[PDB]
């Protein structure tokens, strides 16, 4: 989708306890970036407010990378 | 003078407020609260519609008050005009007001 | 006996028939142990099904209790299973009192009495507050006899009488009332226990 990767990366970089340049595109938030069990999916919850669509609890477990999150965001 | 009579009462009333406003002063802490009366923190912050319940009975007053104002000629008008011609017309306004209240009996409202 | 005995047993034989009547149904799902002493009846119930027992005693033609007025719970750490929910029941047409008990540890959820009784839900809130026993399929489990920001359960025998957080100073903060202060005045722990058993027959073999 056009104009989806640019919007999601801007919101994730602004959030606290995250690297500004080290982790970007196709990198795991829990495995590569370094986040806690509750802190990893917490960034995905904040990203839902910026896009304007509610995310279910079942689909949230599968998402970890911004490249994977961009595909799930499109409906 | 009516103007001098009304203003002297009004100026004396507002002056008594100033006496109670400036004399008692020592400390004003963050102590005063929004709801008071019973205590605790206000669950209903600022303002919320509430409304209803008396919406029909209040509206009817605005409609009835105009008729009572139109009944005010009765003691002041019946002095020069003919009484027999007035009798049919003076009662007429009072009769129809009872008819409107008779329609108010068939389901008055939530009140 | 003139002042020695309180009352003579005469209805005890008729009350013993109740202890047989429910036992004649004979469920391992319900019955277990039936105890009857001092003009009263006590039944303890298996945790798996409590709601079917509560539908019984209510409505029934021979025993029409219906009113399940009082609802208590026991705090005891002697057994392997800790808490014990005790129902106190009363009949208005039959004029008799019967008791319903549970035996499980009930740190794990137990069946609720809200579909059977309408006032039992308020008593169910008392148990969850004081002890920490959750009721399954309960509508609105609100706190009554506990503070709004209270940790643990205020009645348990495992923790002290004075409590962890109890003392509330106003101190240096302008409006916020303090909580973390824990020191209180000394409650004298009476270590009194009289030698020799007062009563025969109550003594158990080791």
């Amino acid at each position: 989708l056009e104009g989806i990767k640019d919007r999601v990366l801007y919101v994730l970089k602004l959030y606290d306890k995250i690297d500004p340049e080290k982790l970007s595109v196709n990198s795991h938030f829990m495995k590569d970036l370094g986040l806690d069990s509750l802190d990893q999916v917490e960034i995905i919850m904040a990203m839902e407010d910026e896009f304007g669509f509610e995310i279910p609890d079942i689909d949230a477990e599968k998402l970890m990378c911004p490249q994977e999150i961009v595909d799930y965001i499109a409906d | 003078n009516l103007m001098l009579a009304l203003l002297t009462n009004f100026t004396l009333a507002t002056l008594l407020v100033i006496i109670a406003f400036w004399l008692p002063q020592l400390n004003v802490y963050s102590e005063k609260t929004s709801p008071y009366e019973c205590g605790f923190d206000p669950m209903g912050s600022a303002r919320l519609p509430f409304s209803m319940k008396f919406f029909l009975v209040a509206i009817t007053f605005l409609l009835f008050d105009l008729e009572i104002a139109l009944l005010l000629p009765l003691p002041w008008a019946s002095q020069t005009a003919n009484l027999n011609t007035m009798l049919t017309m003076a009662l007429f306004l009072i009769i129809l007001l009872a008819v409107s209240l008779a329609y108010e009996w068939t389901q008055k409202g939530l009140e | 006996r003139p002042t020695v005995r309180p009352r003579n047993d005469v209805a005890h034989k008729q009350l013993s028939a109740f202890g047989e009547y429910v036992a004649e149904i004979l469920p391992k799902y319900v019955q277990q142990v039936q105890v009857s002493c001092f003009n009263e009846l006590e039944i303890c119930i298996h945790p798996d099904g409590v709601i079917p027992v509560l539908t019984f005693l209510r409505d029934h033609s021979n025993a029409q209790f219906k009113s399940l007025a009082d609802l208590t719970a026991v705090d005891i750490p002697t057994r392997q299973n800790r808490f014990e929910i005790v129902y106190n029941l009363l009949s208005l047409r039959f004029n008799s009192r019967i008791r319903v008990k549970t035996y499980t540890d009930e740190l794990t959820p137990i069946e609720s009495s809200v579909p059977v009784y309408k006032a039992a839900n308020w008593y169910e809130r008392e148990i969850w507050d004081m002890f920490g026993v959750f009721f399954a399929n309960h509508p609105d489990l609100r706190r009554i006899l506990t503070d709004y920001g209270f940790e643990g359960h205020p009645f348990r025998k495992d923790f002290p009488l004075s409590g962890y957080v109890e003392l509330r100073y106003d101190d240096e903060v302008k409006r916020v009332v303090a909580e973390p202060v824990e020191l209180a005045q000394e409650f004298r722990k009476f270590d009194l226990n009289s030698p020799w058993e007062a009563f025969p027959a109550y003594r158990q073999p080791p």
Binding site: - | - | I25, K28, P52, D59, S61, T78, Q80
Partner: protein
């Protein structure tokens, strides 16, 4: 005439006889060997014979109720609900559940 409870005492005879005849058929579906069927039947059969014998007198209401027919009808109205619930949840017929830990003495 007015009843004590909120439920108004409606002038209806044989109405009590319908509900008691209904519950007898419900009991004879699943439990037969169980005591729940055998013990409830003898109370109902004794009660139904009293209704047939007495011709609309207050003495029929005085037989194990003594609060008019309306109060006795409420016990019959909820009788069908408890009988259906007893058939739905298996407890009367089956007895195989586990027992608690050996401790009772306080």
């Amino acid at each position: 005439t007015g009843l004590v409870g909120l439920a108004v005492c409606e002038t209806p005879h044989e109405r009590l006889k319908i509900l008691y005849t209904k519950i007898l058929d419900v009991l004879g579906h699943i439990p037969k060997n169980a005591a729940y069927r055998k013990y409830t039947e003898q109370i109902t059969n004794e009660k139904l014979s009293m209704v047939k014998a007495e011709p609309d007198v207050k003495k029929l209401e005085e037989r194990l109720q003594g609060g008019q027919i309306e109060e006795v009808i409420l016990q019959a109205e909820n009788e069908l609900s408890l009988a259906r619930k007893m058939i739905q949840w298996k407890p009367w017929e089956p007895l195989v559940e586990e027992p608690p830990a050996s401790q009772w003495k306080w």
